[PDB]
Amino acid sequence: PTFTERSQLKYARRLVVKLGSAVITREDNHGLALGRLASIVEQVAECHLEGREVMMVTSGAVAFGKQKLAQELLMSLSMRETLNLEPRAAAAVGQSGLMSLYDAMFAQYGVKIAQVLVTKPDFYNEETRNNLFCTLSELISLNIVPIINTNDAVSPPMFIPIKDNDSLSAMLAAEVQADLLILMSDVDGIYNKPPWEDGAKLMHTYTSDDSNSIMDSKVKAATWALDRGVSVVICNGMQEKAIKTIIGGRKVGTFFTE
Amino acid sequence: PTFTERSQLKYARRLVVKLGSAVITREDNHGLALGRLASIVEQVAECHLEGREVMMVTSGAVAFGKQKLAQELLMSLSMRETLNLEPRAAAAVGQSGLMSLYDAMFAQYGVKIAQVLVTKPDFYNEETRNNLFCTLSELISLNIVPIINTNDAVSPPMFIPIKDNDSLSAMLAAEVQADLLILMSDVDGIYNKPPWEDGAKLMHTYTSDDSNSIMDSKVKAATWALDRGVSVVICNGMQEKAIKTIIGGRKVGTFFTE
Amino acid sequence: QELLMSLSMRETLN
Amino acid sequence: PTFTERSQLKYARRLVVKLGSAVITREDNHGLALGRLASIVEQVAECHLEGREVMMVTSGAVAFGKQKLAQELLMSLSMRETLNLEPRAAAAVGQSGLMSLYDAMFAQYGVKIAQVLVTKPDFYNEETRNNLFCTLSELISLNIVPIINTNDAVSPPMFIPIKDNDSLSAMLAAEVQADLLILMSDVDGIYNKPPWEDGAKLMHTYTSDDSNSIMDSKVKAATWALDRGVSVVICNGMQEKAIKTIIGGRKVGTFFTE
Amino acid sequence: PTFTERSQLKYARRLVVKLGSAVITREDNHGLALGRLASIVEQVAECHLEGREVMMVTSGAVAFGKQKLAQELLMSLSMRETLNLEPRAAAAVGQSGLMSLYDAMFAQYGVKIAQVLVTKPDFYNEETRNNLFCTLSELISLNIVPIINTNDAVSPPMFIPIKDNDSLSAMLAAEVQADLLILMSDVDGIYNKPPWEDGAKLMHTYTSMDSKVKAATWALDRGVSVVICNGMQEKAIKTIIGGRKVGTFFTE
Amino acid sequence: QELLMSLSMRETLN
Amino acid sequence: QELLMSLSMRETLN
Amino acid sequence: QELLMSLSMRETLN
Numbered sequence A, B, D: 001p002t003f004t005e006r007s008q009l010k011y012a013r014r015l016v017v018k019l020g021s022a023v024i025t026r027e028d029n030h031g032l033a034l035g036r037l038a039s040i041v042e043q044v045a046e047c048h049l050e051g052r053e054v055m056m057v058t059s060g061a062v063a064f065g066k067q068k069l070a071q072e073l074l075m076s077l078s079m080r081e082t083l084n085l086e087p088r089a090a091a092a093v094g095q096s097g098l099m100s101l102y103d104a105m106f107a108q109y110g111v112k113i114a115q116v117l118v119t120k121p122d123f124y125n126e127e128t129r130n131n132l133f134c135t136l137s138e139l140i141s142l143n144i145v146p147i148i149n150t151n152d153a154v155s156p157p158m159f160i161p162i163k164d165n166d167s168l169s170a171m172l173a174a175e176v177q178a179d180l181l182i183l184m185s186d187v188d189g190i191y192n193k194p195p196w197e198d199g200a201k202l203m204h205t206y207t208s209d210d211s212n213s214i215m216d217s218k219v220k221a222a223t224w225a226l227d228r229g230v231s232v233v234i235c236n237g238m239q240e241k242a243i244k245t246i247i248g249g250r251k252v253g254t255f256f257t258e
Numbered sequence C, F, G, H: 001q002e003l004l005m006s007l008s009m010r011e012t013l014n
Numbered sequence E: 001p002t003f004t005e006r007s008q009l010k011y012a013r014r015l016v017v018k019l020g021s022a023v024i025t026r027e028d029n030h031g032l033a034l035g036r037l038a039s040i041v042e043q044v045a046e047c048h049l050e051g052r053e054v055m056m057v058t059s060g061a062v063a064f065g066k067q068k069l070a071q072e073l074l075m076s077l078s079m080r081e082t083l084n085l086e087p088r089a090a091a092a093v094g095q096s097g098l099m100s101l102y103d104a105m106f107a108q109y110g111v112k113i114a115q116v117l118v119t120k121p122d123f124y125n126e127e128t129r130n131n132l133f134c135t136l137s138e139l140i141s142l143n144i145v146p147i148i149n150t151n152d153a154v155s156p157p158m159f160i161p162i163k164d165n166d167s168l169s170a171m172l173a174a175e176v177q178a179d180l181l182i183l184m185s186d187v188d189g190i191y192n193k194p195p196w197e198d199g200a201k202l203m204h205t206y207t208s209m210d211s212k213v214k215a216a217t218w219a220l221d222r223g224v225s226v227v228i229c230n231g232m233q234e235k236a237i238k239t240i241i242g243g244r245k246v247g248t249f250f251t252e
């Protein structure tokens, strides 16, 4: 990799920021988390109006869609039934709503966005893969923030092997040859033992050799994308000013390096 | 088909409205045509808040994207070069912008929309085709207006055989078993000889037998979708209150019937 | 009543 | 005045377009008329990206607010009351919603808008009047479209004497010394006798002398603003491409001249 | 007042939240602070979808307008001048843009907003004052969040005496007889001596910034109970109403 | 029932 | 040149 | 000058 110590992340030229699905929707499931969402959009816009080339891999279209569909189903019962959810339709509604919200929040900063929707078979056809990466590079070189997500509406991938919106981010940030990969999960980082025990220390540096022997999807994707040149940082999405302090060099999250 | 004379279109229960690409962008190519776009959205919202089940097959993501990319490329030259476009990137930018605009215009009426993006191989896998149609029926039965379009960003179909956003509309409105199919082209209808000649009368009723023997893509898709039960009406998108007078029964456009 | 008690909760609000 | 014959309106440098309240809301009162609204915004944006200095005097905040308040009041009854509107609150809600919609529709063209809210006592204080006109001129000289309206929320003027949103437009377009004043009413123009009679011809040119001796608010405001230099054109807002054919020189509406 | 100890703020039925002008725009002045703005809108929407009656007194239309006008003025010079701001116009542009943003962010939660613009002479005419308060009460009783601000576009009041967007908030929350008044300034609270000294402790309870102190003491003598907090803190309203020790609490 | 029949039409939809 | 160097920075971008 | 004449038209507007 090109970055070994955390003090060098100031010169990260190409980012790939992966927004989890617990960083978008609230715990009570009564709308979006505009706090975290708008704070991440603000940090990405101020890291993209600074020269870097950010490229977000969003998630959480299914959860947002499930909320919208629950509302539209509750608003269609008879007055008699009141007095006493498919993943694909949810994905459709949620993707539309989420892209509209991103569009508004980003246009508040003069930044423009684009919506690229990939699938699982688009990463086996060499022609389609090369076309996709030419498209991504061309969009990035025009100061446009692409927002990649799997086409959950017509062919969800759940039903490196792309099995979620994390292996997709690792494959992406390894082919575009990004410099830094920030996985904004909902946990503070990576512990040695699960948090509900005695000895649940945070690991501020995942040393490749030993720590590999002794969140499994995130660890697998991060180790893969690390063996390919990228340097991966796993942080907590529910923290204030996370990207701006990861790139700043302060000790935040887990930093996957040699 | 179920509708033979034009006076019976008042009872059309399931619509499929196909917006051409010349009904969305202006002739000078300096933005959208908010006039025609908002008028069609208003007619669809007032035909969907009336009991019908509308389902739009939009187009013109590539043109809108080409405009946005021309701007973002002109705003990135050096001050020295000023003093003396890929289809896929254009498709990405345009799809995002168009869905955001539809979202705003429809939410002005309380209506909700969903964005389903299909491709050419999604119509050969029987599993994927059946899943897509279950999704569409489930979205329609919740009073949500799906907005179908081909995934031009990663696999454009240009490069019944689905070759454009017209054969797609015919296949769609024949499988969902829609009642009416309205193709909003940019020409007043269908003439016997091209308009720039002597004898360029409009055909207010395309009688199946003879007229088949004596816009070729639109005619082919319309005849196909007519042999399958649907009844197709080709109208002029640049006309004021087109859908509301087609369904009203007034003589507008060409009506493909037996 | 039995017509006001058999409308969808969307028609009632309109 | 500076324009005597309708063929000279191509060189109109400063416009003042007054949108009536019947050009904004529909006849059934179930939302806005996005057709007419978006078409007028499109014509104003394409007449303002051409060098002119447009300045809209909007109306219809009370009607839009009344719709929103009827909804929010119907959605707050008990389930028991269901089974068997102040002008000021309506004005507040409607003004907010209308400005948001204008903002979206105009930003679709790169144009920026500003919201100036005047009252009746702000036209008697010479200090406040001069400050208001300095503000308007400064906003116009930055290629920003101001949108003037009376502060109906806290002091409606209904309850030259400014008695509505028409005398306001005449006073405005006479003090800013505009070149053309377009009153987009809901009637085709000005007839000699009311339309529901025999002899209801349209007057394509309101000759000052005779026609004065033989809609009374609009006529009074137009004659006033005509005696002050401005030249007033009264057209029908429910017509397609009204501003672009008035400025084009075609015979549309009534043209108040000497 | 009705609330004396901080543990009773859970039952605050009527709020009046005053957003400062340093809680809206960033320090570098290159756009809004969507972080703080969206977090406050989220807290107000989740405190208004819970039964309370929130009513925001926004500010910072002039700063946002100044940014927009600087852009539109820089984008209008000749190519030759490039190679080598009135408060009223700024107020107009900023008010429009801010209301549009609030509208979007609130409609993301199903909440509706209304824009009431008052001035200095509208608080002397008894008829106009009574009409304004009837309007506010009627808007609140329909589950609509009014957003009050001074009409800076045509008559800025800078040029209890209403001299800013703080005395306005105190007068408002004293006439509507609100229960709690939250002034979201940009400082952590109220210190005994200025922060850049030795002894700059925070006062967690002001036993009975000069403008904020004057307006708060006034609105306290009238029944309202005022809490001054730091707008740049995460989840400020939800922890003030929760009862946790945050900011300064003006009580007897 | 008499608790489900005395809620505002807004609480029922939530 | 002296016509391209006397346009407003808005006309150049259009 | 030759530094003001070699910036992208986006940096000049900021």
Ligand SMILES: Nc1ncnc2c1ncn2[C@@H]1O[C@H](COP(=O)(O)OP(=O)(O)O)[C@@H](O)[C@H]1O
Pocket: A020, A021, A022, A023, A184, A185, A186, A187, A189, A190, A191, A192, A193, A194, A215, A218
């Ligand atoms: N070794 C571990 N270290 C950290 N978290 C763990 C570990 N094992 C399990 N977890 C839990 O697994 C969860 C992983 O969340 P994740 O699937 O990344 O959320 P999302 O996909 O919605 O962003 C965390 O909430 C965490 O509590």
Ligand SMILES: Nc1ncnc2c1ncn2[C@@H]1O[C@H](COP(=O)(O)OP(=O)(O)O)[C@@H](O)[C@H]1O
Pocket: B020, B021, B022, B023, B184, B185, B186, B187, B189, B190, B191, B192, B193, B194, B215, B218
């Ligand atoms: N026989 C015909 N009848 C009508 N139009 C025709 C015919 N032959 C050619 N045309 C022309 O072909 C064009 C077809 O436009 P079309 O491809 O439908 O536009 P879009 O795909 O952008 O909606 C029309 O503009 C029309 O002028």
Ligand SMILES: Nc1ncnc2c1ncn2[C@@H]1O[C@H](COP(=O)(O)OP(=O)(O)O)[C@@H](O)[C@H]1O
Pocket: D020, D021, D022, D023, D184, D185, D186, D187, D189, D190, D191, D192, D193, D194, D215, D218
């Ligand atoms: N002499 C006249 N000429 C034209 N219209 C008239 C005349 N007398 C009455 N009217 C009617 O008066 C109405 C005036 O509408 P108006 O008040 O301008 O609507 P708005 O204020 O909502 O834009 C028109 O609808 C028209 O039918």
Ligand SMILES: Nc1ncnc2c1ncn2[C@@H]1O[C@H](COP(=O)(O)OP(=O)(O)O)[C@@H](O)[C@H]1O
Pocket: E020, E021, E022, E023, E184, E185, E186, E187, E189, E190, E191, E192, E193, E194, E209, E212
């Ligand atoms: N005694 C004091 N206690 C706290 N802050 C003080 C005091 N005296 C001066 N200040 C300073 O005065 C400033 C007041 O800010 P303020 O005018 O409320 O901002 P705004 O009006 O933009 O919200 C604070 O930034 C603070 O640093």
Ligand SMILES: N[C@H](CCC(=O)OP(=O)(O)O)C(=O)O
Pocket: A019, A020, A021, A022, A058, A059, A060, A061, A062, A063, A091, A149, A150, A152, A156, A157, A164, A165, A166
């Ligand atoms: N189909 C993807 C699912 C992604 C997903 O849920 O996984 P996660 O991002 O939580 O690790 C989506 O659009 O939400």
Ligand SMILES: N[C@H](CCC(=O)OP(=O)(O)O)C(=O)O
Pocket: B019, B020, B021, B022, B058, B059, B060, B061, B062, B063, B091, B149, B150, B152, B156, B157, B164, B165, B166
């Ligand atoms: N890929 C599709 C192209 C559709 C198209 O251009 O054909 P048309 O709708 O003009 O007949 C799109 O999103 O624009």
Ligand SMILES: N[C@H](CCC(=O)OP(=O)(O)O)C(=O)O
Pocket: D019, D020, D021, D022, D058, D059, D060, D061, D062, D063, D091, D149, D150, D152, D156, D157, D164, D165, D166
């Ligand atoms: N207070 C103004 C009323 C204007 C009005 O209704 O008169 P009109 O524009 O119909 O002639 C408003 O905001 O609607």
Ligand SMILES: N[C@H](CCC(=O)OP(=O)(O)O)C(=O)O
Pocket: E019, E020, E021, E022, E058, E059, E060, E061, E062, E063, E091, E149, E150, E152, E156, E164, E165, E166
């Ligand atoms: N005219 C008001 C100014 C209010 C103001 O700046 O004072 P502050 O809210 O910072 O204490 C506005 O719209 O910003």
Ligand SMILES: [Mg+2]
Pocket: A164, A165, A166, A217
């Ligand atoms: Mg995962």
Ligand SMILES: [Mg+2]
Pocket: B164, B165, B166, B217
């Ligand atoms: Mg075609």
Ligand SMILES: [Mg+2]
Pocket: D164, D165, D166, D217
């Ligand atoms: Mg009138």
Ligand SMILES: [Mg+2]
Pocket: E164, E165, E166, E211
């Ligand atoms: Mg102050």
